[PDB]
Symmetry: C3
Subunit: 400 residues, 3 copies
Amino acid sequence: SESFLLNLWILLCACLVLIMQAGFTCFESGNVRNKNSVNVALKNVSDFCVCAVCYWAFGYALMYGNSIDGIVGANGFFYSTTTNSHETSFFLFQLMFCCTSATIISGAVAERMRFTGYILVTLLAASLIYPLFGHWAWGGRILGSETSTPGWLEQLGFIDFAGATVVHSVGGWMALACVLIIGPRLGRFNNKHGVNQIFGDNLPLTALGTFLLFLGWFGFNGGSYGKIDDMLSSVFVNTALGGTFGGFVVLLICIWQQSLLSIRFVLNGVLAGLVAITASANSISSIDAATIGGISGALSFFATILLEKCKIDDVVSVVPVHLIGGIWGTLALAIFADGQYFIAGNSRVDQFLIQLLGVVTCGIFAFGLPYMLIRLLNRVYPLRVSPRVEILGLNFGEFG
Amino acid sequence: SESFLLNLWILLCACLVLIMQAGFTCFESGNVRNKNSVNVALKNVSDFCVCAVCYWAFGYALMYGNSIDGIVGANGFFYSTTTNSHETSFFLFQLMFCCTSATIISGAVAERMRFTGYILVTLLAASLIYPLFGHWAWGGRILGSETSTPGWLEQLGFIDFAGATVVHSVGGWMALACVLIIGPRLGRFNNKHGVNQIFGDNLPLTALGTFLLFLGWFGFNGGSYGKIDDMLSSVFVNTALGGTFGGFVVLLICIWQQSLLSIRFVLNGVLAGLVAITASANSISSIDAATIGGISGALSFFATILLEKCKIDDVVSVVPVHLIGGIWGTLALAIFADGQYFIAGNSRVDQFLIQLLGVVTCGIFAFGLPYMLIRLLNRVYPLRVSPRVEILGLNFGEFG
Amino acid sequence: SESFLLNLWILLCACLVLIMQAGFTCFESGNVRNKNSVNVALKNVSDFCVCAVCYWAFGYALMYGNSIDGIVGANGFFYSTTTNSHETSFFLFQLMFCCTSATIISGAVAERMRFTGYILVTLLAASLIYPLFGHWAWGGRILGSETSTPGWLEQLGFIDFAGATVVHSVGGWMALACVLIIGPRLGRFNNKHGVNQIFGDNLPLTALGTFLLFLGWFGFNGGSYGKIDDMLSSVFVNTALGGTFGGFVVLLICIWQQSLLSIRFVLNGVLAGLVAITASANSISSIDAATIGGISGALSFFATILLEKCKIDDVVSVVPVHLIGGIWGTLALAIFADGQYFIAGNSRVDQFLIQLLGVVTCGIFAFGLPYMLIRLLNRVYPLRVSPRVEILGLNFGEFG
Ligand SMILES: [Cl-]
Ligand SMILES: [Cl-]
Ligand SMILES: [Cl-]
């Protein structure tokens, strides 16, 4: 039966996506202080299970089900059986994407968000924000379907190969809302323009985590390809170049400017390069992959510094990596991608405009609505830990 | 040639099984104190090599060779060549299973078992217990054989898709024998009903380890499927749901009862869910996978507390995860599995009875015989470290 | 299209090779002191990105391009498009090999080499040494080419299945040059024959790293196979036996001689066994894989002790593992490999002689030339950190 190879491919790609969970756990846990080390681990596994349960129970239905009004899908609840012989593999892969998007959120708020806060934000992400935006961008993109209808953004021509916007930007916007609402760590910023660095206690784990993320990204992009043809290997090369030029560019910056704890920035550079090529890995050349990735690295470095100037404390640099990288990648698609991947009646300017409309829509929905709901939640159920718990650390203070 | 795809699948699944070794190393090492950190690592790599050598030299022969009397197989020693074009891939995968079962044993006895004790218990597991029980349950299940004869349990109808009993229960029973014989850590229990917690010093590594185990489990189940058809992806979905509902259920328990160091229990919940679906991933629905996994999570939580009440010190909760999860999964198969996977002349009651006979046989052989031999060994070659070595830690005390 | 399965195989094997990067990071970082922990991580990610950029930009061209004079290839710069439907997958896999070879170098010089020194040595490796030796040994071995010409060593009959010489020996020779030039750590050796051990502070990570390397090695060997046939699974079995007998033999030595911190040696044994079978995994029996791997383990143990006697400080034992294992594997091919894999007009003696010529050529070029250039560089740009930085540690002293 023909359908075997593609199913096996998707299943293996889904496995690689799951290693990104290990990667996030390591990346975050090494960027935090020992007194907070256990919290990050509990949240990463807990967040995963919650997200999976939600996506299985109804998130897949909302995102990929037949569209009632075009807002939201309305079938595929408690996913089990299908007549589409690619759908089960696809469901598993898409479940891993949902888990990715939500996991992304949690690294920004480290060292001062209460545990039940991670859970409630994860619920919001998995239940509403991710599947709804998902439907609008990718609602019609069901592997092996005969019967599918495009989401409204998708129909206007919005392109996102593997989720620079759908996964990465959605996570990043929600992370930005979270850090603005809970506020900066004690001791991070002082009085006028004072910025103290707070360094993780297990930074080798952050390099392990960077390599695990990089590995998982091959599955992330490779499993989104929708088929097999002789151009699949070009998605892999472009993934490798995106990440490596992201890091290499930051390395050049960093040698030049003699950055202290340069390890944080080069590692984030790699991740930003990977995020940026996620929109377009299938539609660009190797030179353009290097270019897009490299620029994303540079953007991540400058965005990190900008956030500090704004007194926003994003512990692992979710916003510089995922949000700025994801916006950059989504727009860059219009600039660099071979025009044959666009709508026939779209020029590069037309593609730029719809990529931008997607970016803006994502910001309004994934920053705007969470910002309002999380601010509401926080008035009646404070999300920041007590000063005592922050000082002593979530390990002893929160988890005894 | 047709046989290529299945061979490549098995080889990749075997690779995933090997990442479970990394996962066990991290899971255990994070649950132990720094003064013992090196011991756990030395034992994990050492145990692997010993087990592999044994399985290659003769364990495969005993487990899968043509059956002399039905007790034990008697060909395939020093495995090299075959006329079965699937046998070499299969041998490698089965070798990784043997290594899995033995590795499982070692986390229960942490912080007070002498190194050479791990080695001798590993020898017992790999040489006798695992391959013999293996033969009885799976002796006929040689990928691509024309000529095979079923083991006696297998012949009566005993079902175990990927080893809830064969791998997980066997390891767990041997772990239980080991902890009973070496006894509890100093400072764990006091006088009447006193229970002191002893917490690991690198618990982020235990989350890394949980994700690596979860990833490896896809290979563990996927490589046991015996073929490819369009239902393979359902084994993957059921694996994902088993693990995630295991963790999710414990999370619900834990929020409710406000558990201290909840991270230990949610992580074990995930592993218990995975163990439970290992018996039946190919024969149940997605809803039943969630159900079986979820119940396994709950059982693991309550079993953990029960063992403490019995003053049994199982450091990483091998028995709650692997043994209680494995027994539960093996019995649950009769309750939930589609009856088409049973013998034609078996009802659910008949299947329940043979699943139970398998459970009991496993306990008698894998707990009973090791308990007796290890107790004998311990009289003449004490397996517990000296109090000085336990207090100072196996790193300095044992490994200088 | 037929070419799909092999491409997917190569891409997945390349993914496994990338996990070796994670493995090296863990292996080295656990063998170093906490005060140096961050440096090792920064160097591992930085080294990767640099190597990738070089290999993409021109290293692939030098190594695999059409041969101008036979010294060096001269096309394939900024690799992008091809008419060979296997070439892109191959390029990615070969890029990961180049990164492997260079990464290997860096663990020997830990705790006292300046960061910019790692970068400059990496540039030398990736720009000149690896691709040029690569061309001579493997220049004609382009997956799916019709038009290829063999490198001069290759033409004489030099065999190296996956790079015991090309990857491992090249890295090891360059590592040896580096440690001789920067010299031993402060406090390592004293006066006459005094040897103080300096132990890593996170040795559990070195076991994680050993398992990740072992896993990646399946991809390393499997992706070098050049095709699919029914003997591919035998390369996997031989990989498993090589590594496990390497460790098992050292375990036997170590129990016997009661080695302190035995974990370091057994782990290195496993890696040495894997390195040794890298030359011949496709051409030997399972018994010979065990034999070659086992001997490599023993050699690694004795080489470790020898280097200490010579007052050479190789922190993670790169030279005992990669160089001594790689030389041993390359020569062992002549001894054990089925003669059908040789040139028709070559006996075992003829094969021995060309394997030896390859070994010697590699030493002259990959030790001799780097030794001279790095010694020159060091006169004008000292590669060793200041005593203050070594004592305080590269984390604070170098990275603030
Ligand atoms: Cl935190
Ligand atoms: Cl221990
Ligand atoms: Cl260093």
